Design a protein around this nucleic acid. Sequence first.
RNA 1: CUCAACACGGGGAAACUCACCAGGUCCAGACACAAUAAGGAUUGACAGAUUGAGAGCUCUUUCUUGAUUUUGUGGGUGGUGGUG
Lengths: 92, 73, 101, 111, 223
Amino acid sequence: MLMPKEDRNKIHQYLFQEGVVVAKKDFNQAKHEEIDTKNLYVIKALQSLTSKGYVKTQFSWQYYYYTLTEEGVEYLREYLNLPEHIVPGTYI
Amino acid sequence: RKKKVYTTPKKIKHKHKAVKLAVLSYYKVDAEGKVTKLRRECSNPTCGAGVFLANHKDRLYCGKCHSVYKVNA
Amino acid sequence: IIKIRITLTSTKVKQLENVSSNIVKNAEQHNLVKKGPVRLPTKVLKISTRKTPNGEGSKTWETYEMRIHKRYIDLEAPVQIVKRITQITIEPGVDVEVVVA
Amino acid sequence: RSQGQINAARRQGLVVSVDKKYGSTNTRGDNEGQRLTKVDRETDIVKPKKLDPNVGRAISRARTDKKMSQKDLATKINEKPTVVNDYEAARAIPNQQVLSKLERALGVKLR
Amino acid sequence: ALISKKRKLVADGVFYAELNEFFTRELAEEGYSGVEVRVTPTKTEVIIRATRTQDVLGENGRRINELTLLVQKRFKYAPGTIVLYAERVQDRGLSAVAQAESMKFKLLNGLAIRRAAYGVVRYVMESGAKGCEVVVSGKLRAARAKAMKFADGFLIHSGQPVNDFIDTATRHVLMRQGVLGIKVKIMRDPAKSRTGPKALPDAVTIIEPKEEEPILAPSVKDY
RNA sequence: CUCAACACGGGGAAACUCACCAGGUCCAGACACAAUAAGGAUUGACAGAUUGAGAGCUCUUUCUUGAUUUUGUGGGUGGUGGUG
């Protein structure tokens, strides 16, 4: 993917912010409903993460389900943020 | 369907490879040390004096825009 | 006091009638005029698929039904006792809406 | 086990452990034959040696990107070319004999 | 609101079916058996019926706070208006969905077909079932498919009592040779049935009378 | 392709469906290794030619982009492709 760097930042921060992405299996879907980027970018960015680890995907009823694993939460820190921040629902 | 014939002329032709010229960022340099504008800047408020207007033949064309900035001269 | 209306809609007969019974039981626990449960005609929602995937075989047909039972009770009550009776009788499978006037 | 004591313990007694083995002689070993009972008597679901997290990713390249193909690689380890296919990234239950032949045919010391 | 009850009640059904298929796919490794939704004002709630709740409820609230987000992101719920509970299973030896997943994962550990299946039927009989039956259909050990069925007790499959006392589950297990089909039918006995009918429709019980005294002593007793 | 194919595939197809035919784009080829590469890996484009076409397809021209791509080697993925 070309996927310009200011759109990795929107995708990767939101995955850090909540820990989950669902995103609607439909390519060329023109501005995904939660992140301000395209829906094709959301599906293909997190395919790159999944093949190397870092996130687990579930597919059901034309929808994806992305869950940030423990090897990905530590990696996504230095990509975007500083330490001692909790991505997932681990925050009580 | 057994095979393909490709009656079109045998075109495995591809795009220009974002044509690799030499170093090109040159306003012009005089001796010690000044520099002056050539291939002048754009009239766009969103082009903050950093873009070069190509002059092909009686055209001034900006590349910051996707398609079209025509201040022709 | 205020004129109220409670509308009940479900797909289960046994789970709906006892909820309306609790509504009326709380209605004459502390007495007030009923306009008790007026049962609307039951709705049968029919889907007629064929039977199969691919059309081989005798042309056999199925019909599937969902039954919608609807009941409305037109009460009047003081403003205080409205919230408690609308919140106590909450049961799975039964959809309750309350119209203010 | 292997000649550590089975000659030293045979000092003029000649019978300790002379019973016969399980008896296949070409069917593979019993390295999970103990685990086969445990999954039989335990009346729930148990997870079968889940995945190959980095022994998949790192050792596929060290083996196959060097010179070889999986159609070649599965031929010298004598398995079907889809067995190595599911040892590539994920989606396998790793058994010992296949993973041992994977190691000794291409050298990379990750188990 | 502003939706007709015909479309409202149907949409509640498809929402339930989407949730159920999600949790079968997601909580496959935790022995999931079902859900039920309780549509209430102020945070409609969802209960998950899975055997190992200590696995479904992850470490320090993970693995169900994640699933709470996954549901409300996909179904566009407001935050905090859905919560996910996990109470475990009522007698997992008698659920055909849970006993089919047990049958499925026992096959994927390389258990023999006749041993993995007789270990499921004897567990269901131990759980107080009146009859259950397990069918394995596919290419079992050859290139030409067969079907083996394993049964104990008795099962009724005739009529309305099928809707009362039969629980069925179908599972696709993915093997090296192809796909095998798992079908589990379990007939819970009507004696331990809490709700609904408690007996088969053609079962009659005669109350045993108490014998009386013949002469009965003709007399009067007064107050 | 007898009952158990032939107003059947819920098959009343103008595009879409669509699998077929004459043609044009795009990668939606993840990851790993190696190479090119901040003396720029690469991306996009006005006008004209060209094209069914306001497809920068491809070419003429010279701007823009900046490390995500490109090339090669393995793979990955998709398939209303085959085998009921």
